[PDB]
């Protein structure tokens, strides 16, 4: 349809605020939608939504549309909002006096809260009408709107205050910046772990029994960088989950799966070396081939039971307004769990493996000083990294995970996500820590030439 250059700016504004979907999806009420929040129908029939879409677009879309087609739909919604604004004696005087950029901020509010909701801002609207930008920005910052949706409102208020697109220019610079850093993190995890996996499979010297456990670690960390970290990066750079409610449950399960398998494998490796370093002869006889494959299967079976079973059975769901809101919203994929799962998952994933690894590696330090310049220094710094890097990466998260479940207000969501990325970073550190043998080095060089 007819596009303008103003029209494209208000399109990119909400593309950032609300997201763009070029395929039919469901909104918070289960209603079929496309584009930037364009309701197709309240009918539960996907074909009926496809008929409404084809009538409006003028093409057999079969549910998929282009960006230009989404802008056609978007501009119609903007025209309707504007016609509403002009019929309302509370919004027309303010609207008529605003420049085009601040005029898009007001339309943004109406898309978020509705015409009636925005008309209740009597005093802020009067201040905007009188061009009292800083005073209007202060008053709006005190709003219920600001406290409910601070990031959205910071961007909109900056638009009222300055009349520019800087809040959205800055958001987009940040988005590309983190996307770079995320892709780097994804590269290190995948490369380092795929390098360890192939080194074991193409070298008979490396196919020992201890390194069979390290293959489990490298595999739990490989899925981490192929499925968990990449999709977890989409929530950071785009502020939303973009893949529907069903994939939010699966992603959440695959993450808890791999995090459980990875840490418990560090626990098995910690036990393995303890037996070989202390009682190497009973070690070589009791730990058979099938017993080593017995532990790894047990680790993964436990990991599936604590991830796919409770999450898909909705046992992990909290029952507050904040949690139920995120569950009904496909665009929300926050980790909001109840107290029981938050503790039970933390114990099975982190706290039990921490206690074993801490106790085991402490006793290796004990029996080393009993049977004594000395090389005890080079082995102590080694233990300091195996436990230091592990603890430093996951301890902040699993402290916040248990606390936040009881006191939701103490752990900020931003801080909570950050601690979870420290744990994500362990999947890159493990191949550096556990594959430092001369056999790996001769193999790693053999693969890269």
């Amino acid at each position: 349809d007819y596009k303008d250059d103003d029209d494209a700016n208000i399109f990119e504004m909400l593309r950032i605020d609300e997201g763009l979907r070029l395929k039919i999806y469901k909104d918070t009420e289960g209603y079929y939608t496309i584009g930037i929040g364009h309701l197709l129908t309240k009918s539960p029939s996907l074909n009926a939504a496809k008929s409404e879409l084809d009538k409006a677009i003028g093409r057999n879309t079969n549910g998929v549309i282009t960006k230009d087609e989404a802008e056609k739909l978007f501009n119609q919604d903007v025209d309707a909002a504007v016609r509403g604004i002009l019929r309302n004696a509370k919004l027309k005087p303010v609207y008529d006096s605003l420049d085009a950029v601040r005029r898009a901020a007001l339309i943004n509010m109406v898309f978020q809260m509705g015409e009636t909701g925005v008309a209740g801002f009597t005093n802020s609207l009067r201040m905007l009408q009188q061009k009292r930008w800083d005073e209007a920005a202060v008053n709006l910052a005190k709003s219920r709107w600001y406290n409910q949706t601070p990031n959205r409102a910071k961007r909109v208020i900056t638009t009222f205050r300055t009349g520019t697109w800087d809040a959205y220019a800055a958001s987009q610079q940040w988005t590309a910046g983190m996307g770079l850093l995320m892709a780097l993190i994804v590269l290190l995890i995948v490369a380092g772990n795929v390098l360890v996996i192939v080194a074991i499979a193409k070298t008979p010297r490396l196919q020992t029994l201890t390194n069979l456990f390290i293959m489990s670690l490298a595999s739990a960390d490989l899925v981490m960088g192929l499925l968990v970290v990449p999709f977890g990066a989409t929530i950071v750079v785009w502020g939303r989950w973009e893949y529907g409610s069903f994939f939010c449950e699966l992603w959440t399960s695959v993450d808890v799966l791999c995090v459980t398998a990875s840490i418990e494998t560090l626990c098995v490796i910690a036990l393995d070396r303890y037996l070989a370093i202390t009682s190497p002869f009973r070690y070589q006889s009791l730990l058979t081939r099938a017993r080593a494959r017995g532990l790894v299967c047990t680790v993964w079976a436990i990991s599936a039971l604590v991830s796919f079973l409770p999450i898909l059975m909705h046992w992990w769901r909290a029952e507050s307004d904040e949690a139920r809101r995120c569950y009904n919203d496909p665009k929300c994929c926050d980790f909001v769990t109840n107290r029981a799962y938050a503790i039970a998952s933390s114990v099975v994933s982190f706290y039990v493996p921490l206690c074993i690894m801490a106790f085991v590696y402490l006793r290796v330090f004990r029996e080393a000083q009993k049977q004594v310049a000395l090389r005890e220094q080079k082995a102590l710094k080694t233990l300091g990294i195996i436990m230091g890097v592990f603890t430093l990466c996951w301890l902040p998260f699993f402290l916040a995970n248990v606390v936040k479940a009881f006191h939701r207000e103490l752990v900020p969501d931003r801080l909570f996500v950050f601690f979870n990325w420290l744990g994500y970073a362990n999947s890159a550190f493990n191949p550096i820590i556990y594959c430092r043998s001369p056999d790996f080095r001769k193999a790693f060089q053999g693969l890269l030439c």
Partner: nanobody, 120 residues
Framework: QVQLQESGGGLVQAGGSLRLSCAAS????????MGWYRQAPGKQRELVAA???????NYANSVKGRFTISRDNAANTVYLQMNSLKPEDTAVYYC??????????????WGQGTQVTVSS
């Protein structure tokens, strides 16, 4: 850096005895395995006696009873007091040391070897 000296080798008649001595210089980690390996012409390398820093032993069952391995208190040396020699024990005996300074893997120290032939 770390070198291990290898003494006690020689030729002897069937039924005699020997006493292999292996002294390892350099610094090593407190938990280790000092062992002896033999390779006869033809067949590949095999272990005979290993001794852990705690005291636990492991003797090849074709070799146990006749052979005894020991460690020195406050000395990085291993002694293989061997008796009741048989003509099937003609092999170069190697001194091996398992270093555990790096906790995740084993770090082998090998030796040059001492020839041992036993007369029919």
């Amino acid at each position: 850096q770390v070198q291990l000296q290898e003494s006690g080798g020689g030729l002897v008649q069937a039924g005699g005895s020997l006493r292999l001595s292996c002294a390892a210089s350099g610094s090593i980690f407190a938990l280790n395995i000092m062992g002896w390996y033999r390779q006869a012409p033809g067949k590949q390398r095999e272990l005979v006696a290993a001794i852990h820093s705690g005291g636990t032993t492991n003797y090849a069952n074709s070799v146990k009873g006749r052979f005894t391995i020991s460690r020195d208190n406050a000395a990085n040396t291993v002694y293989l007091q061997m008796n009741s020699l048989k003509p099937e024990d003609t092999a170069v005996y190697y001194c091996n040391v398992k270093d555990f300074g790096a906790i995740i893997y084993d770090y082998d120290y090998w030796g040059q070897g001492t020839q041992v032939t036993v007369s029919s």
